[PDB]
C-alpha cells in the first residue's frame, strides 16, 4: 500500500517523505526487526523491487532521507548496506542499484543529484569481504606498507555514458556540495586523467580566442572616421565568422543544457558572457552593414566583454585558477543590497542639490549632480563653499550631510562584509577549482558543435570475481602514512 | 648584485658618453637606498618588523595583477576606440594611465562635452570603476581571510634565522 | 638484499621509501621483535653499518621517514634510540 497523499510527498511545507511503502517507512524509521519481518515473513514478503509514485525504491528513499550529519549518515549507511545485503538473499538475480526511478536515476545517481556527499561517498567507495564481495564498487588489488592499490567500478560514473554521475554533479545537481563531490576517489583521479588528455585542447581553444581577440582589437583600433583597407575588410569578416562561430557554439551549449538551464549557468556565468559577446559581435557587424553609427558602441562593448571573457581560461592552471575562486564571492550578493541604500542616498541628495543650486545670490541637472555626488566615492569630491549660489551655506551643509552619511554607510558596508567573509572557514578554493576543471572536461569531451567527438571509455574491463563478474574498473593508488601508522 | 651591475653599466655608459647612462645611474641610486633596508635586521625592533610586514601578499598581488591588467587593457583599447569620434583617451598608454589614476584616487570622471559617444564613454568609465572597486574589495577580503588567521606571530624566529644567515 | 626499484625510491609519485634493506623496513614498520631478530640472530646478523643505494643507513632511513606529528615523531625517536643503544652492543667501536 502506498501512502501517496501530499503529506507524504517531498515539498517545502509540512510533510514526511519516507518513500510511500511500509518497507520504506520501516527502513527510514530505522527498524531492522520490522524490516526483516516485512522482507521475509511467509504471508506477504515485501518486494525490494517495489516503487513509490516517483518510482523510488527503498534505496532511493534512504538516499532522499540522508542528511550530511554524522549521526544520520552513519545510520542510513548501515540501513542501506543491510537492505543491499538482504537483496543478495531475497532477490539474488536483481541489481537493486540498477533500478531507475521516473527521473531515470539509480540510487548512486540520485545521491549525486540531491548532493548527499556521505551516502554518495559510501556507495561510490563500498568494499566487502566474503559472501557480499560482488556488492562492492571498490576492490583492493594489493596493499604494501602505506600503499593501497584499488580497482574502482565506473559503471554509472564515466562520462562515456549519457546521464552519468559526472554529468549530474556538473550540470543537474543544485547543491552547495558539488565541489566536495568531484574531489572524492575515483572521481578526483578520473577527472585528472580526463584533464591531462584534454589540457592541450583547452589551451588550443584559449589560443584561438587570443587570436580572435587580437584581430578584434586591431580592427576596433584602426577603425576609420565615422592594402590597409582590404586587410581591415578581412578583419571585419574574420570577426563576423568568429562571432557567428561563438554564437552557434553557445546556442548549442544552452540547447544541450535546456532541461537544467539555470543549474548550467548559476556558477558558470561565462557561458552567458560568451553568448552576449557573440550576440553583440553579430549585431555590431549587422549595424555596420546597415551603416548606422551605433555599430561602434556595440563593437566597443563586445571588445570589452571579449577581453573580460579571457579571464575564463585562468582556470587552466592551479595558481591563477584557485585565485579566480578566492577572489569572486558573497560580496556580489551584498553589494547588490548596499546599492539600493547608496542609490536612495545618491538620488535623494541629487534632486535636492539641483533644486537648491538653482538660485543665484556643478549641480545643473540630475545627471550632473548624481555624477558630482558619485565623485566623492572615488576620492574626487570637489567640496566647496560656492560663492555665487544664494543658499551656498545650505548647499555646503547638504554636501557635508551626504559625505558623512555615505562614509558611515561605506564603513557599515565594509564591516558587514568582514563579519560574514572573515570567518576562519578553511579555504574551499582548490575543490571549487577542481569542479571548474570537471565542468570544462565534460564539455570538451563532446568536441565542438560542428565536430562531435567519439568518447573514449576510461579504465579496463577486468574480472573482479564471480557474479563472471567482469567490470570496467579504474585503478587508483593511494599512499597514506598518516592513516597507515595508526593501524600498526 | 643588480645594484652593482647597474652601477658598473652606468659608469661604462658614461665613459661611452651615451646619455642612457643617467637613467641607469638613477635606477642604481633607487636600488641603492632600497638595499639599505637589508640592515634593519641588525636590531630586534626594526628587524622583527621587516619580518612582520613582508608576507603572502607578494604571492596573491601577482595573481590579482593578471585580473587587474585584463580589466585595465580591455577597457583602455575600448575607451581609445570610442573617444576617436567628435560630436584624455588619445592612445593605449594615455587611456591605461587615466584608467590607472582611478586606483590612486585621481580619477577625472566626467561627461566629456566634445565626444560623439560621450554618454557611452561615461558608462564605460562607470563600468570600469564599479568592476575595479568590486575587484579591489574581493582582493582585500581574500587577503584578510588568509593572513588574519590568529596563528601566533613567528617573526622573532624568522629574524633569528636572518641573523643566522 | 636491497629493494631498490622505483617503487622503493623517494619521489613525488606512488612510492614507499623505507631505506632498501630488511633491517630498515623492520625499523620503519616499528617491529622491535623483528629488528632484534634481524640484528642478533646467529644465521646472518643485519649490519647496522649497511647502506641503501643513496648510502642511507637505518638511522638516515628513520630521519627520512620522520613526520613532525606527535604520533610519528615520538615513535621514530624511540626506534632511533633503541637502534643507537643496540649499536653500542653490536658495533661498539663504530660511531
Ligand atoms: C565550423 C567549421 C570551421 C571550424 C574552424 C576551427 C574552430 C576552432 C574552435 C576553437 O578553437 O574554439 C575556441 C574558442 C571557444 O572556446 P571554448 O569552446 O573552449 O570555450 C568557450 C567558453 N565556454 O572559440 C574561438 O576562439 C573562436 C573560433 C574562431 C577563431 C579561430 C582562430 C584560429 C587561430 C589559429
Ligand atoms: C605488484 C607487486 C605488489 N607487491 C607490493 C609492491 C612491492 S607484492 O608485495 O607482490 C603484494 C603485496 C600485497 C598484496 C596483497 O595485499 O594482496 C599482494 C601482493
Amino acid at each position: 500500500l502506498r501512502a501517496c497523499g501530499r503529506f507524504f510527498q517531498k515539498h517545502q511545507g509540512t510533510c514526511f517523505y519516507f518513500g510511500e511503502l511500509p518497507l520504506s517507512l520501516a527502513a527510514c524509521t530505522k527498524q531492522w526487526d520490522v524490516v526483516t519481518y516485512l522482507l521475509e515473513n511467509p504471508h506477504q514478503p515485501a518486494s525490494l523491487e517495489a516503487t513509490d509514485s516517483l518510482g523510488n525504491t527503498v534505496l532511493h528513499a534512504l538516499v532522499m532521507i540522508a542528511d550530511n550529519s554524522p549521526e544520520n549518515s552513519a545510520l542510513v549507511i548501515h540501513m542501506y548496506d543491510g537492505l543491499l545485503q538482504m537483496g543478495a538473499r531475497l532477490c539474488p538475480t536483481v541489481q537493486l542499484e540498477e533500478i531507475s526511478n521516473h527521473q531515470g536515476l539509480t540510487p548512486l545517481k540520485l545521491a549525486a543529484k540531491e548532493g548527499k556527499i556521505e551516502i554518495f561517498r559510501h556507495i561510490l567507495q563500498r568494499e566487502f569481504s566474503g559472501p557480499y564481495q560482488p556488492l562492492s564498487r571498490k576492490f583492493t588489488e594489493w596493499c604494501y606498507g602505506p600503499v593501497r592499490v584499488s580497482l574502482y567500478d565506473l559503471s554509472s560514473v564515466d562520462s562515456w555514458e549519457k546521464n552519468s554521475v559526472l554529468e549530474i554533479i556538473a550540470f543537474h545537481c543544485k547543491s552547495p556540495n558539488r565541489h566536495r563531490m568531484v574531489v572524492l576517489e575515483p572521481l578526483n583521479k578520473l577527472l585528472q586523467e580526463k584533464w591531462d588528455r584534454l589540457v592541450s585542447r583547452f589551451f588550443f581553444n584559449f589560443a584561438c580566442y587570443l587570436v580572435y581577440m587580437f584581430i578584434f582589437t586591431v580592427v576596433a583600433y584602426h577603425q576609420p572616421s565615422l592594402f590597409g583597407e582590404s586587410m581591415l575588410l578581412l578583419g571585419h569578416i574574420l570577426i563576423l565568422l568568429g562571432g557567428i562561430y561563438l554564437l552557434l557554439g553557445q546556442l548549442w551549449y544552452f540547447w544541450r543544457r535546456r532541461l537544467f538551464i539555470w543549474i548550467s549557468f548559476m556558477d558558470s556565468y561565462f557561458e552567458i558572457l560568451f553568448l552576449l559577446q557573440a550576440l553583440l559581435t553579430v549585431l555590431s557587424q549587422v549595424l555596420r552593414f546597415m551603416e548606422t553609427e551605433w555599430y561602434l558602441p556595440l563593437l566597443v562593448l563586445s571588445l570589452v566583454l571579449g577581453w573580460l571573457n579571457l579571464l575564463y581560461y585562468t582556470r587552466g592552471f592551479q595558481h591563477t585558477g584557485i585565485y579566480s575562486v578566492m577572489i569572486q564571492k558573497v560580496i556580489l550578493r551584498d553589494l547588490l543590497r548596499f546599492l539600493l541604500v547608496y542609490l536612495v542616498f545618491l538620488f535623494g541628495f541629487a534632486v535636492a542639490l539641483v533644486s537648491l543650486s538653482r538660485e543665484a545670490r556643478p549641480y545643473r541637472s540630475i545627471l550632473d549632480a548624481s555624477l558630482e555626488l558619485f565623485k566623492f566615492t572615488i576620492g574626487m569630491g570637489e567640496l566647496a563653499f560656492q560663492e555665487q549660489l544664494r543658499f551656498r551655506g545650505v548647499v555646503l551643509l547638504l554636501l557635508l550631510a551626504y559625505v558623512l552619511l555615505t562614509y558611515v554607510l561605506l564603513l557599515n558596508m565594509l564591516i558587514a562584509l568582514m563579519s560574514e567573509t572573515v570567518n576562519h572557514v578553511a579555504d574551499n578554493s582548490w575543490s571549487i577549482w577542481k569542479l571548474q576543471k570537471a565542468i570544462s572536461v565534460l564539455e570538451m569531451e563532446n568536441g565542438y558543435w560542428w565536430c562531435r567527438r567519439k568518447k573514449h571509455r576510461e579504465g579496463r574491463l577486468l574480472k573482479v570475481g564471480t557474479r563472471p563478474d567482469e567490470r570496467w574498473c579504474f585503478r587508483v593508488e593511494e599512499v597514506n602514512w598518516a592513516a597507515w601508522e595508526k593501524t600498526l
Side-chain angles (χ1 to χ4, degrees), chain A residues 201-202 204-213 215 238 241-243 245-246 248-250 253 270-272 274 309 312-313 440 443-444 447-451:
Chain A
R201 203 179 198 85
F202 187 83
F204 176 72
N205 290 1
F206 171 58
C208 290
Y209 192 80
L210 274 175
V211 170
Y212 166 75
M213 287 311 309
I215 294 162
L238 295 175
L241 294 180
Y245 180 92
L246 290 169
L248 293 179
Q250 295 305 118
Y253 178 81
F270 287 103
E271 303 309 324
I272 300 167
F274 273 82
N309 286 354
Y312 169 80
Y313 302 98
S440 177
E443 279 298 310
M444 285 192 290
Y448 307 115
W449 66 267
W450 62 275
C451 179

